[PDB]
Structure formats: C-alpha cells, structure tokens
Design a protein around this nucleic acid. Sequence first.
RNA 1: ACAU
DNA 2: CGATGT
Length: 135
Amino acid sequence: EEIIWESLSVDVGSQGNPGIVEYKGVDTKTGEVLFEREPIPIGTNNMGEFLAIVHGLRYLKERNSRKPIYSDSQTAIKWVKDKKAKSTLVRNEETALIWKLVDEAEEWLNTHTYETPILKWQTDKWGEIKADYGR
RNA sequence: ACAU
DNA sequence: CGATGT
Ligand SMILES: [K+]
Ligand SMILES: [K+]
Ligand SMILES: [Mn+2]
Ligand SMILES: [Mn+2]
Ligand SMILES: [Mn+2]
Ligand SMILES: [Mn+2]
C-alpha cells in the first residue's frame, strides 16, 4: 500500500549477468548511501541481491535498528527466508569469490537471529527502488 | 506468469 | 535481444 519511508533499501548492480556484481544500501527517505560493496568480478543478479539483503540485516543488527529492508528481488527475499541461496551459477575457480561470499552469508543467517521485516519494493507502483544503479 |  | 530465478 504505502511506502515505509523509515527503512533501508538495497539493490544489486551488474556489468553482465553473470558478470561484475556490486550492491549498495540507501536510506529510503533521503537516498543517502549507507554501504556499498566493492565489485565482485563474476556473480549473478540474484546472488548480489541476496548478499545485499544479508548485508543489510547485519548492518541494521550492528546498529540496533529495527527498520525493515526493501528489496525488489522476489528470488533473494525467498533465499533469505529459506537461509539458502539456490543459485545455478557454476562453482569453479572464477566464481569462487562470489560463492564464498554467498556461503558465508548463509552461514551468518544460520548462526544469528533478527526480526527485520524483509519487504517487497513494489516497483510497478512506486518506480525503481532508491538503491537502484540506473543502469 | 511473476520478480529481476 | 540476452541472463537469473520461483
Ligand atoms: K526492478
Ligand atoms: K524467464
Ligand atoms: Mn534489484
Ligand atoms: Mn551454501
Ligand atoms: Mn536495480
Ligand atoms: Mn536495472
């Protein structure tokens, strides 16, 4: 219905899919960039969307914030709920880094608790999520 | 189909 | 047009 402005919005950006992946989190109200991950040479859109949510969970937990997280990724929201990122990306030498980060994100989810609501950003009604890369 |  | 996912 309405945008919860008191929230964190996250998104992936990429050069190719699979390709170079990065992500960031922004204050939904102001657009202030709160975190940005250094580009990862090969990953998928969904792996990056997943890492962005998990990073958001960790960022908010560390700061004792109860804000929700918005993501525009149906897939990544489900992977976080399941604590399991069901990516199809080949596990090989060139994908080792993204897969390490994904495995470590799952590991964090499996060893920590959170109440953070993870909400679908309704692009069809609200436009692009505020963390979008404009590309 | 829906979401990226 | 191609891709990643449920
Ligand atoms: K989108
Ligand atoms: K498809
Ligand atoms: Mn997105
Ligand atoms: Mn794993
Ligand atoms: Mn985007
Ligand atoms: Mn885009």
